[PDB]
Design a protein around this nucleic acid. Sequence first.
DNA 1: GCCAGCTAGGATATCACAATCCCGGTGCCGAGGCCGCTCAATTGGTCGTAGACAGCTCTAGCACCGCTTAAACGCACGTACGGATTCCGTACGTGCGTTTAAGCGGTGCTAGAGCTGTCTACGACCAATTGAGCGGCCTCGGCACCGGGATTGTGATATCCTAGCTGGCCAA
DNA 2: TTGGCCAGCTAGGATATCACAATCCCGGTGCCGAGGCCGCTCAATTGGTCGTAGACAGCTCTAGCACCGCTTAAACGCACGTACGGAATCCGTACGTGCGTTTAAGCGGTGCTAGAGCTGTCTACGACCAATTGAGCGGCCTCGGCACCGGGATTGTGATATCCTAGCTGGC
Lengths: 105, 105, 78, 97, 99, 95, 95, 84, 84
Amino acid sequence: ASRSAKAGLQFPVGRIHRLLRKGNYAVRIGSGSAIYLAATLEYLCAEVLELAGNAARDNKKLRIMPRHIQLAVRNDDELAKLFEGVTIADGGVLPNIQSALLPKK
Amino acid sequence: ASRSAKAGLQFPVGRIHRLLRKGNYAVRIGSGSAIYLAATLEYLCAEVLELAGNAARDNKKLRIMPRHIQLAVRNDDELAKLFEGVTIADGGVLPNIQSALLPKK
Amino acid sequence: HPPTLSMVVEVLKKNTERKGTSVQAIRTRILSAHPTVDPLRLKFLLRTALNKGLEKGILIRPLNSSATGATGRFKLAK
Amino acid sequence: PHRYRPGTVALREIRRYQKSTELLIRKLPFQRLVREIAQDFKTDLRFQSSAVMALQEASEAYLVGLFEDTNLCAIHAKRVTIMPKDIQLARRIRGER
Amino acid sequence: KPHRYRPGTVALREIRRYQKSTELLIRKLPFQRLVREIAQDFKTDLRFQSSAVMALQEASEAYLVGLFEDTNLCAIHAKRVTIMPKDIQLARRIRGERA
Amino acid sequence: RKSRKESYAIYVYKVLKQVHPDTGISSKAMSIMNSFVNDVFERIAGEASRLAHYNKRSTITSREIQTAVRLLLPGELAKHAVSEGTKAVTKYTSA
Amino acid sequence: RKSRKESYAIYVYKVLKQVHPDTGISSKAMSIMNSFVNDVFERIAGEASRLAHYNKRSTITSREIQTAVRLLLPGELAKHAVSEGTKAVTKYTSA
Amino acid sequence: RKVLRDNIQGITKPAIRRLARRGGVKRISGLIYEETRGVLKVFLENVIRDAVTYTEHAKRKTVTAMDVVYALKRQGRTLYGFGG
Amino acid sequence: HRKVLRDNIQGITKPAIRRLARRGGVKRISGLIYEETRGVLKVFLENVIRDAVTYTEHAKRKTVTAMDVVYALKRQGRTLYGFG
DNA sequence: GCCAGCTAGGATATCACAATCCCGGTGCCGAGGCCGCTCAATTGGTCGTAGACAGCTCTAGCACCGCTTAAACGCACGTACGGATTCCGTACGTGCGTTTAAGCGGTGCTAGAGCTGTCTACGACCAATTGAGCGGCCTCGGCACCGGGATTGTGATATCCTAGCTGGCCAA
DNA sequence: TTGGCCAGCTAGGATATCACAATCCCGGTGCCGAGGCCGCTCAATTGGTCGTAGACAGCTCTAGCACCGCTTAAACGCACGTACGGAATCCGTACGTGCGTTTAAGCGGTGCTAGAGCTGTCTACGACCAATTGAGCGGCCTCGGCACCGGGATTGTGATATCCTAGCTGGC
């Protein structure tokens, strides 16, 4: 059976494991390491996907639009402050307006 | 005999070679690669040392002072523009004055 | 509060500066002189008042720059 | 006849272009540019279609990101126009020549 | 009449004085004890190598100065000879320091 | 045609079920997600590999992994993610 | 005491002869030079290693090295340095 | 093939309009745009160079998008959405 | 008996920040600067030591070597020379 | 009521000085230089294996053509914001003058980091199997574009209200 | 007669008024990117080996920490004072806003090539094992450049004295 089932997870732990062997990082690879990294990736995908959809039904689409990923990463510090040098194809920019730009009153 | 002699060089080509093997970069290492990198390091040491001394006898010392390395890297674009995130212990800063700071006339 | 030229000649009397009083000094002394000045027209009202005090001869000019009669220092005629 | 006040329009397209994500330049000039600037490094080069897509996307992203910085600089300068001096100032601060 | 230097004289004077010298500027003891508190929160009872705190001070001083000259450019662009905080967070944000 | 782009697509797409069983996706966004995860991967890998070499180990294991993750990930990510990995490893050893 | 800091010190210090047979050195500066060269080393190493993995090679050789060097080094460095490496490799193969 | 020249004006004056707009700036001085034409023109230099070096390393003479993305990511300019 | 220190952020004195800025080529400074600078400094420190201590404990050390510090600095692109 | 001397200020040439640079000598220590150990280097034979070469096809890069409109380009024009001026207020430099606490040197404590030796839990190797994941084809339901009305928001106007203006009325 | 009181003009500013078009929100459609489905397969999945990298226990000594007495000198507080920053004004222009004319790039559509990825073939070279040795590292001794100190040269700064010259008050 699959360790992923034995881990209850979605990424192929043995596949990441071979990535490590042909990742040319260390000569020796502990087993649980791959599981642990897989769980990390589980979670990371979790926020990014969920909050993209969060934005998604906000302008009420049924499917994810890279607009929405772009916005999704914009509104959270913990994400953008993780993703500085990150530029997104067809991402666009978050809606920001500067105050003094506005008409006086 | 030493390849360094057979290369006429100053850095230990076989030593860098073992660095590569325990550098965990590739499973396979071509021989001339180490020689080539050694020559690079030759040159790099050449500019840095020579121009530090260049500054050195300028305020006329007999020995190199990290002041002088700091200055040495400052005056050349090709070096500093190589060495942005580089901070030097007891380096200090190059002598720069801004114009408008001066008395008017 | 009376009309503007009265305050202008008043602050002329109260300011014994050797070069008189700058349009800056004129305006700031006017604004520090009365509260009901309606601050939305002091610059224009005072500028026109200075023009009228100059053309009438009420205002005399110790030092100014040409074509900046409204930008300078004035004195009362005596 | 009917006439708009200055800048009101400007703000309109500010919002317009801050809503969508398309490509803001015209292609053929851009790929032309890519070609000659490539010429200087090797003769008779060749590009994939997607390569220039990445080129334009990175380019426009870089330009808009530096533009907003220049805008901030002007805002600092008690200022609503962008002047070259603002450009060099921001460029210096980010530290590229 | 005691002699007086007009203002900015001493300014430019030890601008040269410090812009030529190289030693450490902050008193080491206050620095290191500051380090000790700021470390305490993350883990208790932490032992520090002598060289480590000196490295900290070196890097910190480099960072602070490097920010300072940039703030200087910010202020001069304001046609001002003084630094004000607004310059500081201006430069900080342009560098991209989210805080 | 005899080639394989061996992405992560099925995986992340299967992910987007249990949180949002109703939502769709764009292919471009899908590609961005793939590129994303391969990124976060090899940065974690680079971190840990540098680490063990410092520590003159030859082995990569979950403990140095968890440090490296607690290194790169800023904020409350560092806590929830490590917790999930702990529990995941925990149930795995349970056979 | 039974340990070895196996620096590059003798090497760079022997270097500073043939250019400046008369000049001295500070120990701090000497350490900075060591740290320097180990830096430029592992950055070159990282470059080349990334390269061959792109190129699905398993071998690191002077050719990919020379590209990587021509990559990182800006300006006329890139030319003189590659020239020196060429000639050095050249005489080496001459046995 | 033919050698082409001077399409730098090809970044047209109104294009820098659009860029300004997405940048959220209101009004512009004239002297910007050639300066703009300056900065853009340098930037491509720094990347395409790297890109072509990537290409020729693999003994290539057709530029893949992958070449571009590697060149960018080395410049701390990570871009997503194109291949891997 | 364990030493717990408090509010030494003020320990950086008025002339301290003065002289530092003086290195930076500034002659004229506001009194309102000092407080944020010490705050500024503070955050940078809380940035560095954070990973550094994790580095140290990664080794099961509870004394910090300079190497921990230098690797920390390295990680934010703040390369320091001379100590390792 | 009108002219000279007074007087004030302002620009320019001149002096004093104290902060800085430069010098010779002193001593001090960090840099340099020699000697002894060894392990991490060279050196030689091997295999097998990634890599060089060679040929093909067929996929994508590329030239080219026609068309269109949509975007660009050149032009008036004015207004609204930039830039130069002044100035007044003060938050600043800056130069006493005191005090502490930072440095510094020393000592005593220790523990915690590090090196030594031990065992063993576990991780690659390898052969064998499969079912899970790739991709290729089809369908369909979400959505981009088209067209029309409604709301807000903007720009101009007419009015209201007000303060100052200017002339009429009355007492000195 | 005439200057002050008054009262109504007057002009302007503030203010509410109305008019339009820009976007938004609504429908409607064909269009296509997502998705379901099926077929192929290769990395994953098991089990056993065997080795070995790490885990633990057991020391020692080094470096860190804490305590202690001088020694300032750097810092703090404070007085004084001015030159800078805010502010505000005023003038000039240049760039946004609109218009009218042009054209050139998308597009789409097609014919055309070469070069990229594929297969298949040969081999040189580097990982590997064991032997050998000397260059490198540390350890020790040393001495020659330097930092410090002290004792003159210089000068950029702040003050000063001269001069001039222009607007006011005494004299004739």
